[PDB]
Short mmCIF file of the C-alpha atoms (twelve columns), coordinates in Angstrom:
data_MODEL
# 
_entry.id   MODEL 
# 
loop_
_atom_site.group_PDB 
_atom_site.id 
_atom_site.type_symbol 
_atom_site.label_atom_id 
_atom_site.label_alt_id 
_atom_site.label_comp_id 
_atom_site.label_asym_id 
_atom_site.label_seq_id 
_atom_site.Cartn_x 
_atom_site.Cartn_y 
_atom_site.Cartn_z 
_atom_site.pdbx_PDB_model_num 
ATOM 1   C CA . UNK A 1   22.685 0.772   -41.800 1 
ATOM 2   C CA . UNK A 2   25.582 -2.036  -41.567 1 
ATOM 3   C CA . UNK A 3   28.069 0.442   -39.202 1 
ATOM 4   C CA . UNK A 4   28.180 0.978   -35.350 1 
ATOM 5   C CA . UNK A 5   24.944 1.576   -33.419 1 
ATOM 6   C CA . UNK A 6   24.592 4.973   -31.907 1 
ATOM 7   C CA . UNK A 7   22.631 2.679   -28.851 1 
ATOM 8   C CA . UNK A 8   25.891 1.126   -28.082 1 
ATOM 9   C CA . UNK A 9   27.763 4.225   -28.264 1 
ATOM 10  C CA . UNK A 10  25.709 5.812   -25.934 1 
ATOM 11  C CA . UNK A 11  25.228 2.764   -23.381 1 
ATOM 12  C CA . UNK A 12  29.398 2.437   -23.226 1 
ATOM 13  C CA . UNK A 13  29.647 6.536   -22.876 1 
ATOM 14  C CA . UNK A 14  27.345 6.570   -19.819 1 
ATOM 15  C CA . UNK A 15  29.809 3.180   -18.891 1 
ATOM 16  C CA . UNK A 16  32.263 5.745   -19.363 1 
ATOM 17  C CA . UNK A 17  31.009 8.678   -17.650 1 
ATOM 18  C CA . UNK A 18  30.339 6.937   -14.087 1 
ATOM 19  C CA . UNK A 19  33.706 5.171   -14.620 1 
ATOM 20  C CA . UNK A 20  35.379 8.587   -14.899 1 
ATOM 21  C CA . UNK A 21  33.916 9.982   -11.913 1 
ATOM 22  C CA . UNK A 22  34.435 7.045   -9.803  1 
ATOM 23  C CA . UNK A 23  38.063 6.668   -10.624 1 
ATOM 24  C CA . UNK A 24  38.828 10.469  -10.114 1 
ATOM 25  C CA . UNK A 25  36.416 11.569  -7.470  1 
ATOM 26  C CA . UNK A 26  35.657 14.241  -9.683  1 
ATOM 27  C CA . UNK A 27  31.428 14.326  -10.068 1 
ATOM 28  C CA . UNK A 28  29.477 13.157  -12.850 1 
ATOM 29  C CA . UNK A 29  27.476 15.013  -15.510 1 
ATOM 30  C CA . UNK A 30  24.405 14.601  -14.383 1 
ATOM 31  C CA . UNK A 31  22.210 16.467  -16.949 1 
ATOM 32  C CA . UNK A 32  24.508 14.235  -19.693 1 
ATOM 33  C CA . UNK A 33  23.582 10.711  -18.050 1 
ATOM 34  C CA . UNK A 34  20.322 11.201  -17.236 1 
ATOM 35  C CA . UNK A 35  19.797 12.151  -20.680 1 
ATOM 36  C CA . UNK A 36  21.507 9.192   -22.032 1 
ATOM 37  C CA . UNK A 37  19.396 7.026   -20.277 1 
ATOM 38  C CA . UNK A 38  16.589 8.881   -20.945 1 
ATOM 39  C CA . UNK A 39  17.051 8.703   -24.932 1 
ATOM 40  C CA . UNK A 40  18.133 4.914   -24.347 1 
ATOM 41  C CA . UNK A 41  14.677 4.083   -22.962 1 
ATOM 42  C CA . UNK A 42  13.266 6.321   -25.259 1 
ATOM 43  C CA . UNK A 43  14.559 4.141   -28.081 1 
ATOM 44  C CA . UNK A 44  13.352 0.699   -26.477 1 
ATOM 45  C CA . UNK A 45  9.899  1.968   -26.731 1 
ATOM 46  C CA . UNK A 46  10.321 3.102   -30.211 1 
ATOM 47  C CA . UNK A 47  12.067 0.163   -31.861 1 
ATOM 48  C CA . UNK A 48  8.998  -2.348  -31.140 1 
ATOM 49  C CA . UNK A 49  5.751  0.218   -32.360 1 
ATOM 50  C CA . UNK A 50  6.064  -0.366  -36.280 1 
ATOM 51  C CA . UNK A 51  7.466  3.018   -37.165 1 
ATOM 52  C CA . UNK A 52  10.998 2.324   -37.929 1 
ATOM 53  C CA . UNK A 53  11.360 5.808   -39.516 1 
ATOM 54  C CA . UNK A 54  10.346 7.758   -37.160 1 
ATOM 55  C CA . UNK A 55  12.679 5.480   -34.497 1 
ATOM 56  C CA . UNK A 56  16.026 6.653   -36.892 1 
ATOM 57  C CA . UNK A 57  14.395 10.017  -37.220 1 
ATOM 58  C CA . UNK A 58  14.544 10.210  -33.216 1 
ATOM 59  C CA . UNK A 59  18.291 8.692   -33.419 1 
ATOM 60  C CA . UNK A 60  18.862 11.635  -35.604 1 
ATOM 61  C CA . UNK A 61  17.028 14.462  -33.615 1 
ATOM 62  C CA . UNK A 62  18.915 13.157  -30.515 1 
ATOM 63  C CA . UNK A 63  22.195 13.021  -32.069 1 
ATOM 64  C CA . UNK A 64  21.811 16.623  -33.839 1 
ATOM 65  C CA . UNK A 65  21.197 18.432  -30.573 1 
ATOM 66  C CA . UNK A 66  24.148 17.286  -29.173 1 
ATOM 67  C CA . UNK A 67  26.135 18.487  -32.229 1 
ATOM 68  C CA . UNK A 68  24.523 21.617  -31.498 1 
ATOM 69  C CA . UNK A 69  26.218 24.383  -28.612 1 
ATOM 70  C CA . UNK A 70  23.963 23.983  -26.080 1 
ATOM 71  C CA . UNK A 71  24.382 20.455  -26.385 1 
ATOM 72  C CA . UNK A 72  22.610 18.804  -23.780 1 
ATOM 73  C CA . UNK A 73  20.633 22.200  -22.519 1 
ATOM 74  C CA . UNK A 74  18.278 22.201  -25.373 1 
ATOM 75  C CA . UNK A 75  17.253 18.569  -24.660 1 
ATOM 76  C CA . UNK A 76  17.129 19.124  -21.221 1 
ATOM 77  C CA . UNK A 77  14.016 21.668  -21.443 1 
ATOM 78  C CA . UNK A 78  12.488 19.879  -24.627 1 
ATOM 79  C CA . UNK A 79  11.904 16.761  -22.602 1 
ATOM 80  C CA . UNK A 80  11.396 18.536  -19.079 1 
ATOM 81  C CA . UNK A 81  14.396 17.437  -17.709 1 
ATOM 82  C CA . UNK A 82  13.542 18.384  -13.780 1 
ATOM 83  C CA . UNK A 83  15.389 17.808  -10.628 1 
ATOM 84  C CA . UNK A 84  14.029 19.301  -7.488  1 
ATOM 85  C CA . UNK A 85  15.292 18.833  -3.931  1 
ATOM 86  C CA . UNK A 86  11.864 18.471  -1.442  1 
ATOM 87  C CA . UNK A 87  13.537 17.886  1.769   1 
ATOM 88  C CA . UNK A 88  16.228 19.462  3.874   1 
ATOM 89  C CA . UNK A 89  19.541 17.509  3.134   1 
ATOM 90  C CA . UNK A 90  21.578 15.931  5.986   1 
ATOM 91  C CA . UNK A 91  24.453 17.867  6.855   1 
ATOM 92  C CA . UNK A 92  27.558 15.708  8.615   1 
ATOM 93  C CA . UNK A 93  30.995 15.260  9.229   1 
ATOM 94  C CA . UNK A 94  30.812 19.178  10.171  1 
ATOM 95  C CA . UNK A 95  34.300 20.622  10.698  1 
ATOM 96  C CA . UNK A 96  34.899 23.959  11.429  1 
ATOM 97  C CA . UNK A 97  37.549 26.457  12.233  1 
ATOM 98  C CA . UNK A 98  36.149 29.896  14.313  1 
ATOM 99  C CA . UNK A 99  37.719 33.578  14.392  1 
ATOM 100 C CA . UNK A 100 36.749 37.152  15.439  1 
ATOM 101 C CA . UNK A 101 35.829 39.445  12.107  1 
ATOM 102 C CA . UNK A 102 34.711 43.007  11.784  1 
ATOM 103 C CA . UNK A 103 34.570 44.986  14.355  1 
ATOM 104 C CA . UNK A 104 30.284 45.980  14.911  1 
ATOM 105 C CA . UNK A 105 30.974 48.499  17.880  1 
ATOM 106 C CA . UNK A 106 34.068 49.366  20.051  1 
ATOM 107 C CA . UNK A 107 33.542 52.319  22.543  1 
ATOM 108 C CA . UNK A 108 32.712 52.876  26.282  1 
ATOM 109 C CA . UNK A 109 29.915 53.961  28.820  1 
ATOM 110 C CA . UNK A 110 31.929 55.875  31.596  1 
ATOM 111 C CA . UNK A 111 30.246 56.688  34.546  1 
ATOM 112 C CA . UNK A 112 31.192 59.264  37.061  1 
ATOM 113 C CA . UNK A 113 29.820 59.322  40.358  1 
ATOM 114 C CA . UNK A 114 29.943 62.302  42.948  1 
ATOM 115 C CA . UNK A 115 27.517 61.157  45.525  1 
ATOM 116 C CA . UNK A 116 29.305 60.504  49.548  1 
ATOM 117 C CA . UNK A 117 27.398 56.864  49.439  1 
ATOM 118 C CA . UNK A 118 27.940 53.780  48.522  1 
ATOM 119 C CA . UNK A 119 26.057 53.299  45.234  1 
ATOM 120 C CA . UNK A 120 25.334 50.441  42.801  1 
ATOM 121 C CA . UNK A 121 24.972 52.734  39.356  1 
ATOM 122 C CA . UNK A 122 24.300 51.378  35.512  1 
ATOM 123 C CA . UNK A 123 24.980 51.702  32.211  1 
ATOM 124 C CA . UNK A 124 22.217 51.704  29.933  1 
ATOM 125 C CA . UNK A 125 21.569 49.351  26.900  1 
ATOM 126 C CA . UNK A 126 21.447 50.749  23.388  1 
ATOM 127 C CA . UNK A 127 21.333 48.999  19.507  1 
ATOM 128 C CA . UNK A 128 23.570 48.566  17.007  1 
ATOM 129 C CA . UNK A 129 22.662 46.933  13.333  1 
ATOM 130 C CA . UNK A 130 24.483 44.883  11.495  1 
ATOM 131 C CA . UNK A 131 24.611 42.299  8.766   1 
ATOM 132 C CA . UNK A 132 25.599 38.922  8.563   1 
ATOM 133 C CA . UNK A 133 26.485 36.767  5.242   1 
ATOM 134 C CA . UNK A 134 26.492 33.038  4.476   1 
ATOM 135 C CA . UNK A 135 27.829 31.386  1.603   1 
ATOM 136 C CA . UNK A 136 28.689 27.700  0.335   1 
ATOM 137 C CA . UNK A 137 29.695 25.457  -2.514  1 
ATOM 138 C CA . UNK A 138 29.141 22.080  -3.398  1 
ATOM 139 C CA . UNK A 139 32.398 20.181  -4.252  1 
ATOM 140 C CA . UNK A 140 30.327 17.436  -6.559  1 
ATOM 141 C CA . UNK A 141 27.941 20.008  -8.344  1 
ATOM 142 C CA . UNK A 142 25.774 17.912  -10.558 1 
ATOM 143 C CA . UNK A 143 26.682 19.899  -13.811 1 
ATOM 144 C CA . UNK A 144 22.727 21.125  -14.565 1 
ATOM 145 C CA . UNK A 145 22.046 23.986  -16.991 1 
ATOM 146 C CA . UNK A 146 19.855 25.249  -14.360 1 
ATOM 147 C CA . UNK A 147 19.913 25.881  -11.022 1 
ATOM 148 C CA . UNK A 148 19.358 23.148  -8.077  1 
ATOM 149 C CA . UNK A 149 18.757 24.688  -5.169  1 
ATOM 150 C CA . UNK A 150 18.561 22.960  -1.930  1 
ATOM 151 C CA . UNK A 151 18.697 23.769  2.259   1 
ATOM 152 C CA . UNK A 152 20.487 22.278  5.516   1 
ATOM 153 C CA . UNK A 153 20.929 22.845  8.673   1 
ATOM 154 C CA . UNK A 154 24.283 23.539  9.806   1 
ATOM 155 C CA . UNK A 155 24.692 23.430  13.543  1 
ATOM 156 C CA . UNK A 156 28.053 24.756  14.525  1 
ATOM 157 C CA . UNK A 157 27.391 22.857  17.870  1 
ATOM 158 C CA . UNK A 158 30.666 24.226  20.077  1 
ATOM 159 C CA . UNK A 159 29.881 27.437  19.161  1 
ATOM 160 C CA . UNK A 160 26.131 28.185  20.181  1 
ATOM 161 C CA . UNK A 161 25.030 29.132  16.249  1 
ATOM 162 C CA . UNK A 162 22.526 27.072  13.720  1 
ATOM 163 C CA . UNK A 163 20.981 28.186  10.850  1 
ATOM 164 C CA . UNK A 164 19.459 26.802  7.429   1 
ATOM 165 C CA . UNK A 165 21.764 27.850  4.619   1 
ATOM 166 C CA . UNK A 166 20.993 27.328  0.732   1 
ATOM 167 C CA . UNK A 167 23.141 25.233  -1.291  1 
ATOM 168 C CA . UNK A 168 23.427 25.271  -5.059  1 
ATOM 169 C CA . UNK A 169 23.790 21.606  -6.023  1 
ATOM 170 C CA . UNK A 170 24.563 22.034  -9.720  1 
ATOM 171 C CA . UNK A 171 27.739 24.556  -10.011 1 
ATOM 172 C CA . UNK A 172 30.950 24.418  -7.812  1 
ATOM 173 C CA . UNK A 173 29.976 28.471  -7.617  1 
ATOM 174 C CA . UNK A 174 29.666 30.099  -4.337  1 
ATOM 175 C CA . UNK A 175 25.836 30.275  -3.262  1 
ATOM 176 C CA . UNK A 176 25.698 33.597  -0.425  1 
ATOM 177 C CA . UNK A 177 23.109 35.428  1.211   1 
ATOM 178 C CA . UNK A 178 23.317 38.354  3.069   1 
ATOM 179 C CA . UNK A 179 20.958 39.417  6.170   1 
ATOM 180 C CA . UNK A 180 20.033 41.897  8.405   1 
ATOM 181 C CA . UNK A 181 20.226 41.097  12.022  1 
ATOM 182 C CA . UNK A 182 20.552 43.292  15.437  1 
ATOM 183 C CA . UNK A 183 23.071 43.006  18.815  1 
ATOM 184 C CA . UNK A 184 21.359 45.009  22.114  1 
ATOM 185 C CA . UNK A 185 24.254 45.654  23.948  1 
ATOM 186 C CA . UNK A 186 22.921 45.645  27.816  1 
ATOM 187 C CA . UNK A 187 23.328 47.426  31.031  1 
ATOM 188 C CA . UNK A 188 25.602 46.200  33.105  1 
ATOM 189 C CA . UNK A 189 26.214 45.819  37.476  1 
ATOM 190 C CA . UNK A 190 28.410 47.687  38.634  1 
ATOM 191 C CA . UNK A 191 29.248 48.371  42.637  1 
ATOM 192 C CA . UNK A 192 30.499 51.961  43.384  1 
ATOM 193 C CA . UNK A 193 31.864 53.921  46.398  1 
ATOM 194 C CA . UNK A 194 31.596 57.322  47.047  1 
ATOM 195 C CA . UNK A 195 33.920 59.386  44.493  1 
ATOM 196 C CA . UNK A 196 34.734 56.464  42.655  1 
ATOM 197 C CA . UNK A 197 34.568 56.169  38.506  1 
ATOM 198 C CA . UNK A 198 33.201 53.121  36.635  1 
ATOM 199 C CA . UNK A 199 34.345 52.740  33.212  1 
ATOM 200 C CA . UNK A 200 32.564 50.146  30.596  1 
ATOM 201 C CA . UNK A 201 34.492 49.001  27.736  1 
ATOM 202 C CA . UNK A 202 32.580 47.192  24.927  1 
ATOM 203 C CA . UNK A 203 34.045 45.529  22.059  1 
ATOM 204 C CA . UNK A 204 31.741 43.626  19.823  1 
ATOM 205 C CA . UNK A 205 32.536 42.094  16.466  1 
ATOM 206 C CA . UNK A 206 31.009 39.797  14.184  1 
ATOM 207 C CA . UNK A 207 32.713 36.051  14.236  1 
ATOM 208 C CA . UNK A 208 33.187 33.682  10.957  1 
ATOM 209 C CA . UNK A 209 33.142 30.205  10.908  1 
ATOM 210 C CA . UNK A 210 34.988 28.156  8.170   1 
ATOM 211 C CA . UNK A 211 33.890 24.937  7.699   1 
ATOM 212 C CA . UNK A 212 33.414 21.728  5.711   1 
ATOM 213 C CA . UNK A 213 30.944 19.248  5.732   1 
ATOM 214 C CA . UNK A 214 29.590 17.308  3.792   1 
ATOM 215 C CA . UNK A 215 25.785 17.009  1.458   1 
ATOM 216 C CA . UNK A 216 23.279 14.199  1.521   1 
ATOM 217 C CA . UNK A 217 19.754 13.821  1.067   1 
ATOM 218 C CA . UNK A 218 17.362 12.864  -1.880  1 
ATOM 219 C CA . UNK A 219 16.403 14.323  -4.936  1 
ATOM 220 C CA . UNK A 220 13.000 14.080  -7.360  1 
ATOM 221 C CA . UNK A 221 13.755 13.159  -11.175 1 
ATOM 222 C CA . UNK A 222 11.201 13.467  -13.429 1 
ATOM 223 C CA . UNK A 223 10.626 13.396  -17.373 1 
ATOM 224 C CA . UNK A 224 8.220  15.965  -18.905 1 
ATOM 225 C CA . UNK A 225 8.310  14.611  -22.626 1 
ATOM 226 C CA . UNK A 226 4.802  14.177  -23.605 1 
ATOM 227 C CA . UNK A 227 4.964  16.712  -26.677 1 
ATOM 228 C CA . UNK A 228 8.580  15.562  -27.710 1 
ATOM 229 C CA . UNK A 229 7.932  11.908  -27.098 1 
ATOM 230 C CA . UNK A 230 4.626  12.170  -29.529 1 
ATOM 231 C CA . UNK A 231 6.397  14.062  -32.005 1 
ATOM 232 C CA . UNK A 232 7.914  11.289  -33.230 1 
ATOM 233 C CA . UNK A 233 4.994  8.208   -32.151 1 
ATOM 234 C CA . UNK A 234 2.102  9.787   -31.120 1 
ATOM 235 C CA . UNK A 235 0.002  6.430   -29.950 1 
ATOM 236 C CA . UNK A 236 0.759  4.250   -27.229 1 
ATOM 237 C CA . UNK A 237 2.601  6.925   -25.096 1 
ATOM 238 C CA . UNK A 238 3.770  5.876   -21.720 1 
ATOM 239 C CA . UNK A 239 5.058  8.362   -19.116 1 
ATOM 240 C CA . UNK A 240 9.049  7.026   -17.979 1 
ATOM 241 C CA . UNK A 241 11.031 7.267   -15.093 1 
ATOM 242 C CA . UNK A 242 14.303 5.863   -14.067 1 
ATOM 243 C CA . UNK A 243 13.116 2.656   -13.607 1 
ATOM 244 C CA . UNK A 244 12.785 2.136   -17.235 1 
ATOM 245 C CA . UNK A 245 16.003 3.625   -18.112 1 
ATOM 246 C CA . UNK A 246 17.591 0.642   -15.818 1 
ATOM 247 C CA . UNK A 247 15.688 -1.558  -17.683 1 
ATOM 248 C CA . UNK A 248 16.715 -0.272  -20.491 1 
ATOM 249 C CA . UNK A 249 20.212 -0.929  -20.307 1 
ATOM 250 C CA . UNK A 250 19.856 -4.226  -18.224 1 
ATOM 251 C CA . UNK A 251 18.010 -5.694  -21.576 1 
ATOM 252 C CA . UNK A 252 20.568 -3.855  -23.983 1 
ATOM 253 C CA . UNK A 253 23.523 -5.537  -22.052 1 
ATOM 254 C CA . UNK A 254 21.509 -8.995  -21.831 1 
ATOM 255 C CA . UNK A 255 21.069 -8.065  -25.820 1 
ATOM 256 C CA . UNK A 256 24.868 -8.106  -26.838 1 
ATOM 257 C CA . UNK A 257 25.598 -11.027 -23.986 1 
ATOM 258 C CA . UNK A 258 27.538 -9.070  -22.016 1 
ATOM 259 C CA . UNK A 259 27.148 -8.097  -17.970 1 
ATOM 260 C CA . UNK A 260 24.125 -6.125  -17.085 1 
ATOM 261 C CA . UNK A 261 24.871 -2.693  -15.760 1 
ATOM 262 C CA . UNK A 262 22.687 -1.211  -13.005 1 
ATOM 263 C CA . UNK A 263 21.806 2.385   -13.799 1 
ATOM 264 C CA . UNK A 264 20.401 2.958   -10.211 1 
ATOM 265 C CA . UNK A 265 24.432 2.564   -9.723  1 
ATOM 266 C CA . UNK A 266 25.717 4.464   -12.352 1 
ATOM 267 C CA . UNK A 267 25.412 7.947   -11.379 1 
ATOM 268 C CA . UNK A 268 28.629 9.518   -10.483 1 
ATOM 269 C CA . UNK A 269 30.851 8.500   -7.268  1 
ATOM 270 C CA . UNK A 270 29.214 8.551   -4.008  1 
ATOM 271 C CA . UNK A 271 25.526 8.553   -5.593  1 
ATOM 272 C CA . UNK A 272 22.895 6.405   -5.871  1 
ATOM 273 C CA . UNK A 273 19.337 5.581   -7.008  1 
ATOM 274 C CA . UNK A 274 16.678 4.967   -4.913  1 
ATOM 275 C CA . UNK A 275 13.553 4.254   -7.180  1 
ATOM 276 C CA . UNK A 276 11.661 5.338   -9.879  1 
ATOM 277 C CA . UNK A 277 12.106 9.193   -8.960  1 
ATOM 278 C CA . UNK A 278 14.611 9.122   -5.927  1 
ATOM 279 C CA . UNK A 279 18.230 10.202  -6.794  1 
ATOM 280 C CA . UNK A 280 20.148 10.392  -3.816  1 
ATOM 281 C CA . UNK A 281 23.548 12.321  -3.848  1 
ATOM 282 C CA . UNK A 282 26.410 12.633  -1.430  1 
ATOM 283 C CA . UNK A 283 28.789 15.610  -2.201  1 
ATOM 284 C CA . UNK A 284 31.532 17.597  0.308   1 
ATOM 285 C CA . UNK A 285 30.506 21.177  0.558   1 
ATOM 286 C CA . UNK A 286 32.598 24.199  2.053   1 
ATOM 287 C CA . UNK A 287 30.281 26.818  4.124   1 
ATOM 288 C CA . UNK A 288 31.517 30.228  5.767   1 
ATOM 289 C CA . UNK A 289 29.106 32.399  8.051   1 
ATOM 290 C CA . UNK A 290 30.381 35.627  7.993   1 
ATOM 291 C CA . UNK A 291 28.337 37.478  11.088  1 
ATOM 292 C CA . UNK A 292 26.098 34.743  12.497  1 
ATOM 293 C CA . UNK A 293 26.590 35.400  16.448  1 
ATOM 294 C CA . UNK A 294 28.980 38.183  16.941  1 
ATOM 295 C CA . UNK A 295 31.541 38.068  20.197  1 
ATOM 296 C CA . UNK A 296 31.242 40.508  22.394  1 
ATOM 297 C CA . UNK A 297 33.133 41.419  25.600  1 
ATOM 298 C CA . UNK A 298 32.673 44.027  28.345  1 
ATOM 299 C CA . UNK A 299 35.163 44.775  31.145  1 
ATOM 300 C CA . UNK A 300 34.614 46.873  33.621  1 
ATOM 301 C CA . UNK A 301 37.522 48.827  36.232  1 
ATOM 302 C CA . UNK A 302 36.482 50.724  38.755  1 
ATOM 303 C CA . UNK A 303 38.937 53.773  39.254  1 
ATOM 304 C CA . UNK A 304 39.175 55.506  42.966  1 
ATOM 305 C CA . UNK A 305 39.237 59.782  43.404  1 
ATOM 306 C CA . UNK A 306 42.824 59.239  42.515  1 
ATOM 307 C CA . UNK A 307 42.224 57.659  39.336  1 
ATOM 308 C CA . UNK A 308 43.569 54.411  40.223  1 
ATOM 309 C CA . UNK A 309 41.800 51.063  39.384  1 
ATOM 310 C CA . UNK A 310 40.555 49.284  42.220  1 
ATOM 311 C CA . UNK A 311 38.861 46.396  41.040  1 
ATOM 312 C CA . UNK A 312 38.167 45.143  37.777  1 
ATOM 313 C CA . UNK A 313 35.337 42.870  36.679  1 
ATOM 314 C CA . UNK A 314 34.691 40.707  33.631  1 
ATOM 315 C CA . UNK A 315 31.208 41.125  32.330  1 
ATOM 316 C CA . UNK A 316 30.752 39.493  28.788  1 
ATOM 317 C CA . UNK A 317 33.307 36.649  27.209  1 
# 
C-alpha cells in the first residue's frame, strides 16, 4: 500500500489513550483499548495464515465500524466484548460525613395515672414503615456501552450501619436503590407516684451518610469472536485473551525497534492487569445512604398533680 500502517496508528493511539488518562487522572476508555488490542492481536494471527486479502479485508471491516456512530459499540457485541465483576470489590479509604434527614415519626405516648400508689406504668410499642435509599457513582467509570455492575460492602464503622451497595462501574451516573425497611418503636420504664403524669416524647428520623471511598477489586475479560474471527479465516482459529494482546504489541514494538510497551500496564491510571482474564481497577466512588439506621430519641418528664416536671429521664440517644 506504500502509506502509513493502520497497525501503527492504532498501537500509538492506545500509547495515547493510557498516556491521557495517566497525565489527567481522568479514566480511560476501556471498551476503546481493549478493542484496540483486541484487533491488534487479531491482526498478528492474520498476517502469517496465507490469506493476505482477507487480513486487509479485516483492516477494512475494523476501520469502517469505527467510522460508523456507534463506533466502538457495534464491535463490542460482534466480538463478545464481556466484562463481568465475580467478586465483591474492596471498599477503603471510607470517609464519611453523618446528619439527621426526614422526619419517620414525631408524636407522644402520655400517660395519666390516678391510682394513690406508687406505680411503675408503660408505654406500649407500635410500627412505623419506612424506606431507605442508597445510591453511588464511580469517579473512573470504564466508558462501556453496557452496563458493569458490581457490589461492596460499605461499613460506616462509627456509626453502627453496613450494607452491600451496587456500583455501576462503566458511567459516572448515579446507581440508587430504594428499600423497604421497618423501626418498632418500644415501651419504655417509667417510675410513677400517685397522681403523677408521664409524658413520652418520640422523635425518630431517618439519618444520611455522605461519603467517599474508594473501588478496587478484579474484573473477568473475555473475547467471544468465534463467528467474527472465522468470517474472515475460518481454519486455524485460536480463542485470545489479554495475554496475546500484550504480546501483540511487545512484538510490534520489538518490530519497528523501538521500546516494548506492556499492555497489562496500559489500561488507564490506577489500573492494572493481572493475567490472561484479570483486569483489576482502582476508581474513587461517592456513596450516600439515605435511611439506613434512622436516629431516634425518647425523653421522658414526669409531671406532679400540679403539672410541674419532677424528673426527667433520657431514654433513647
Amino acid at each position: 500500500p506504500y502509506a502509513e500502517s493502520y497497525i501503527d496508528t492504532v498501537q500509538d493511539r492506545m500509547k495515547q489513550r493510557d498516556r491521557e488518562s495517566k497525565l489527567t487522572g481522568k479514566p480511560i476508555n476501556m471498551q476503546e483499548q481493549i478493542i484496540d488490542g483486541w484487533f491488534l492481536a487479531r491482526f498478528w494471527i492474520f498476517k502469517d495464515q496465507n490469506n493476505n486479502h482477507q487480513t486487509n479485508r479485516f483492516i477494512s471491516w475494523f476501520k469502517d465500524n469505527l467510522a460508523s456512530s456507534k463506533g466502538y459499540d457495534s464491535i463490542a457485541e460482534q466480538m463478545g466484548l464481556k466484562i463481568e465483576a465475580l467478586n465483591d470489590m474492596d471498599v477503603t479509604n471510607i470517609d464519611y460525613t453523618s446528619k439527621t434527614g426526614d422526619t419517620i415519626y414525631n408524636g407522644i405516648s402520655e400517660l395519666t395515672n390516678y391510682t394513690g400508689t406508687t406505680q411503675k406504668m408503660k408505654t406500649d410499642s407500635f410500627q412505623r414503615d419506612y424506606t431507605k435509599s442508597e445510591s453511588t457513582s464511580v469517579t473512573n467509570g470504564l466508558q462501556l456501552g453496557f452496563k458493569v455492575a458490581a457490589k461492596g460492602v460499605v461499613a460506616l464503622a462509627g456509626a453502627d450501619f453496613e450494607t452491600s451497595v451496587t456500583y455501576n462501574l462503566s458511567s459516572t451516573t448515579t446507581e440508587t436503590n430504594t428499600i423497604s425497611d421497618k423501626f418498632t418503636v418500644p415501651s419504655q420504664e417509667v417510675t410513677l407516684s400517685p397522681g403523677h403524669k408521664a409524658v413520652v416524647k418520640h422523635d425518630l428520623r431517618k439519618m444520611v451518610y455522605f461519603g467517599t471511598q474508594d473501588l478496587k477489586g478484579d474484573l473477568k475479560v473475555s473475547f467471544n469472536d468465534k463467528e467474527i474471527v472465522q468470517k474472515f479465516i475460518y481454519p486455524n482459529y485460536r480463542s485470545i485473551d489479554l495475554s496475546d494482546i500484550r504480546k501483540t504489541m511487545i512484538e510490534i514494538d520489538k518490530w519497528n525497534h523501538v521500546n516494548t510497551i506492556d499492555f497489562y500496564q496500559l489500561v488507564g491510571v490506577k489500573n492494572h492487569i493481572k493475567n490472561g482474564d484479570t483486569l483489576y481497577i482502582d476508581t474513587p466512588a461517592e456513596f450516600t445512604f439515605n435511611g439506613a439506621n434512622p436516629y431516634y430519641r425518647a425523653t421522658f418528664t414526669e409531671y406532679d398533680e400540679n403539672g410541674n416536671p419532677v424528673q426527667t429521664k433520657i431514654l433513647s440517644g
